Symmetry: C5
Subunit: 311 residues, 5 copies
């Protein structure tokens, strides 16, 4: 088999569509997601044309090996897609309608800057390479792009699944390549982060601030050091759910800042004890009373600054 | 091979059945389960009809390649099922009996709202896409739906395996699609959660309440902060066995609420110490004595409220 | 190819044997084990019979495709076995000798009631489904059942590998099915649990009891709470190596009971401090002295009761 | 099929190229990385030459089975590459142009000495084994070596992808072997290590040094021991992201050194308490005051020495 | 295809060789290692004899399916090897030279008694089963046994790769089997265990001994209990890298013994406090002073005894 011959000098247009059946396993650390979908292909092959009257058939079915089929690949996949051909239908003018169901693990970078209040645009890049005989170009049949209503991605909200209609045509290894960008827009369900990480982390921080209403150094050291350790546990927990980024994430920024608050609280607790031992408690009392206001105020303002820089 | 031709205009009815052999790996985080089962298919193909008197044979056995077989797929699977054909039998009137043994990893959402006292309905969706020549519709042969007595799903009780007899017929990418819903009803074995998570979590909480019978601030801080850390460990342990949900689970609610009790216990311990330092112990004594009753009472009532909202 | 025809009305007897080459990966949480073995099959096929004199051979070697071979399956496997045919040999009277080497992941429930002093019976269920043409029944050739001397299952002692000689014949979807039960008896190597979990867990408990020889409330609180946290760590460690069971395991029972001992030790430490503060130390001394005997005595008796109930 | 015959006595030159499409999963512990790339091959097969004016066709497209193709393998792969042939083109003179898209998991040792400020040279070794008929030698077509602009390796910066043009020709098992070295130069994005591991580890260390401004032994013991435990947690966290090395890494050296600082701080806190109990506080005061300067000074100098030895 | 016929009555000798290309993933817990190697095979099949004059060629190249190939298997593999035939060369007398490149996960028991200062002998067992027509025996061609210079097993030193030249010929299921033992001798790189586990574990132990220079019970309890918890963390860390053994490992013995030292240190700290409360500090001072010498001395002697018993 060889590619369909051009009537004039035109490129062969392969119309495409992706219909999502299942979306699962969005792995943040790996920056991958698994997909199960229909891939539809359509092109004209004059050599397969027929007259309906003398044939007695309005449509003709073929086996993949019997006819020429464009070698369509995904750019951003781990391994080649697992595909099973569903149907190959030919109309009288030789218009081929190809349908396959596939499953693939897709590599798509994620922007963690606003985590866990982030949104992402996942990409599925469709590609075809041209042959010596002719140039093969991809197109989007919008009527064949979509997703099942039941498509759920655990921990995410699916906003839209659209295709950038104009392909990116370019040369690769001295042959032209036609690339389409299918975009799946998603937004993270931040809900669970509030009772599981955010609030517990705030509670332990506020508990360390009770040391500003205590003159007991031994108790103060216990309050600040114990809560700091619990903060380290949350920092470790958060970083296990995320890849290493060359930038600060919103959560990472807050987590990092909270260490400064623990560090300054230890200085305050030390200064307070030192003065009381040096028979200067009036003074230590001034520092402690100021700290009761300063710590929550600086915490609020620093958070407003951070939220502003990130959102 | 091509589909059996219609006598009139009727759709081809493919009778189905699923008989569960093994159920394993119900993964809560992934919202998947693995299944090993028999898939039974039955349809009439008049082209295969024969005379039983002259043939002397009641049944003819065919190889899958020799005859036309409907392309039956599962909607909610990770990858296409791993199937092995067991038997193909044809009756004299041309009724085909197909039997395969398959294994598949099934995607089925779980409702964690009542965890670990939850029940689930797992789904296995069977599907067929109509061909250009004719419309294919699915039916349930109840005589071929079931499960082996030894079918065990570790940590769950299997209640029933039934099929919704009426298929969901709909158009998808300009063809008809016939979908059947096989339902596996299961209930979680909550037993182990009691001695492993629930009771240990209650013991540490009650231990924090012994601070209401102590005037030692240093010991009190140690009691409340140490048990709080142990509570954080249980919170982390619980969240590792569960996916992130856009809602509160029953366990999540209790775990979250317990933080409030630790937070208020720290305030009480602080207030008590502050008053004793300020030479107001009679007052501190009133707050501490009230706390001895208030803490267990509010804990009981808050739990009754939560159990009511969730069950 | 079709099954051997019956001389009278007899079912076809397929003689079986399993010879274990390798046993590995007994996964307690998954309740699976991996096996690498020889599967031997033998049956009479008269159509294959030959005269040794005429043919000039005493044995005939065929390829699997050339002759009829029974469709033998394993019931309790995750996926169908990975098998490679080693030999097919036909004797002059049509006695077929089939040999394959296979590997499979087997599902076999485990009873954790006596963990880590437990013994198990792993099962490998061989099955055959009858054909329209004839009924197929399985038998055990004891001369072909065994295991390599070097077969080792990490963390277990292999006791025996035997087969229940009488098959379980039953109807499944109006066809006879013949099931054989191959049993691998194993006993857990409990050794390492003693220095790694049991003794460390007892040491920390005994350390909590030193609080019965101390009047220092602050030190007592530190002793009991710190050791309780270490006990929580061991509880978590143990539960990670085990699946969730709808029953109490021996270790689970001891682990759970030890919490009660920590809880009562906290009450004692609290009561002691409360009385001393209330200027009643003579009394507190009576409770503390009683506790020094009561705690180890009740611990020993409770352990004798538990060991009795479990063994 | 057999290899192309030599015109004189020359070895067959197979021109190669690797074009990276995707780079993912650089696993530090496993010392592996996954790659998805184009592999291009070119050689002269005179038996395939044709006339350009007579034939009318400028290029002939063959199926892999139709022609002789050199058996090209990767040395440093876990399993054989997953490959799909994209195109085979023959020019009039018989120059074959082969193109495949492959995916592979590559074993490539990493030097962790400067971790997390390390750079690596990943290798992809291409190999060909000569045949009895003739010797096969590899060459690099630099026009066919490259990488997609979008190639991202999470947590790393990709510097260059080049090939050592001169193959390593050697005898192995009495036949010639021709090996090419493709080099992917990468540098680790150390950014995230600063707020996640480095700074938290420095903060806890500085917190231990507040014990040099405290006379309270009980508080000092709590400060030094608690922070040491947090240091152990960071040591464990770091070692989980790294394989075991027969050398010290930069981070490993710092982590190890910090233990010495905790050890000496415990000695100081002990010495201070001992002297105060012995009614020698003037002296304990001299040791404590010296420690306030000595600890940060020795820490700075030891770090300058370490950075010098490692960079 | 059938086996080559014997000239007299001798068994067919299949000469073997294994050349290691890659060694990776030595998994201590699983007692497995992955291997990528060349498997060379050589046997005489006179039925393949040819005249170079008539056929033109001096050596014939065959496809595996075209000729008889001995069914060579590995005994100790999880699944059947992933193999790809590199060459099948037949010389005029009928001597076959077979070369395949394979990858396999090998089961090989490990002796952890001296861990992490242990050495191992990994085995790769090659096997052939005899057929009816004739007996097959294996031999080692030493010229074809070896390893690539670049072969590295992360965390191990490779000493030698040799074969036991004499096969183990034995009967199995009424047929002969010929088994060869390929041995890979390795020694563990213990380096990293010193700064990561050994020294940190010794530092925390020595820190607990500072309690012998302190009269503060509350500080002593904190010193001994905190370091004990850190010791538990190291015990857990070590046991995660190792399988459960029915014997004591060297590290396991030291780790276990250190618990006894913590237990006795708690007794000492308790005894000291008890006597001081009972107004007997002179005596308490004698016990504490003795402990300062006894603890390090008994620790040194117990380690000399253990090192002696293990090495
Ligand atoms: Cl693809
Ligand atoms: Cl499917
Ligand atoms: Cl099976
Ligand atoms: Cl029955
Ligand atoms: Cl029957
Ligand atoms: Cl390869
Ligand atoms: Cl093998
Ligand atoms: Na084609
Ligand atoms: Na068919
Ligand atoms: Na057969
Ligand atoms: Na070829
Ligand atoms: Na304390
Ligand atoms: Na063969």
């Amino acid at each position: 088999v060889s590619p369909p011959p051009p009537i004039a000098d035109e490129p062969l247009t392969v119309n495409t569509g992706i219909y999502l059946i299942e979306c699962y396993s969005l792995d943040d650390k790996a920056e991958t997601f698994k997909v199960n979908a229909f891939l539809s292909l359509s092109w004209k092959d004059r050599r397969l044309a027929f007259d309906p009257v003398r044939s007695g058939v309005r449509v003709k079915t073929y086996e993949p090996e019997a006819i020429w089929i464009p070698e369509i690949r995904f750019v951003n996949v781990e391994n080649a897609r697992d595909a099973d051909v569903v149907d190959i239908s030919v109309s009288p003018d030789g218009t081929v309608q190809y349908l396959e169901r596939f499953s693939a693990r897709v590599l798509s970078p994620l922007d963690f800057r606003r985590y866990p209040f982030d949104s992402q645009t996942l990409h599925i890049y469709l590609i075809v390479r041209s042959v010596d005989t002719r140039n093969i170009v991809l197109a989007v049949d919008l009527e064949k792009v979509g997703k099942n209503d039941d498509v759920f991605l655990t921990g995410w909200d699916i906003e839209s699944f659209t295709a950038v209609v104009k392909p990116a045509n370019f040369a690769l290894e001295d042959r032209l390549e036609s690339k389409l960008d299918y975009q799946l827009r998603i937004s993270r369900q931040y809900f669970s982060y509030i009772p599981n990480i955010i609030l517990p982390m705030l509670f332990i921080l506020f508990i360390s601030w009770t040391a500003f209403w205590s003159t007991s150094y031994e108790a103060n050291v216990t309050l600040v050091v114990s809560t700091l350790i619990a903060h380290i546990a949350f920092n470790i927990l958060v970083e296990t759910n995320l890849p290493k980024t060359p930038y600060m994430t919103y959560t990472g920024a807050i987590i990092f800042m909270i260490y400064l608050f623990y560090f300054v609280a230890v200085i305050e607790v030390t200064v307070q004890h030192y003065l009381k031992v040096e028979s200067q408690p009036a003074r230590a009392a001034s520092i402690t009373r100021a700290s009761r206001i300063a710590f929550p105020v600086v915490f609020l303002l620093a958070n407003i600054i951070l939220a502003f820089l990130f959102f």
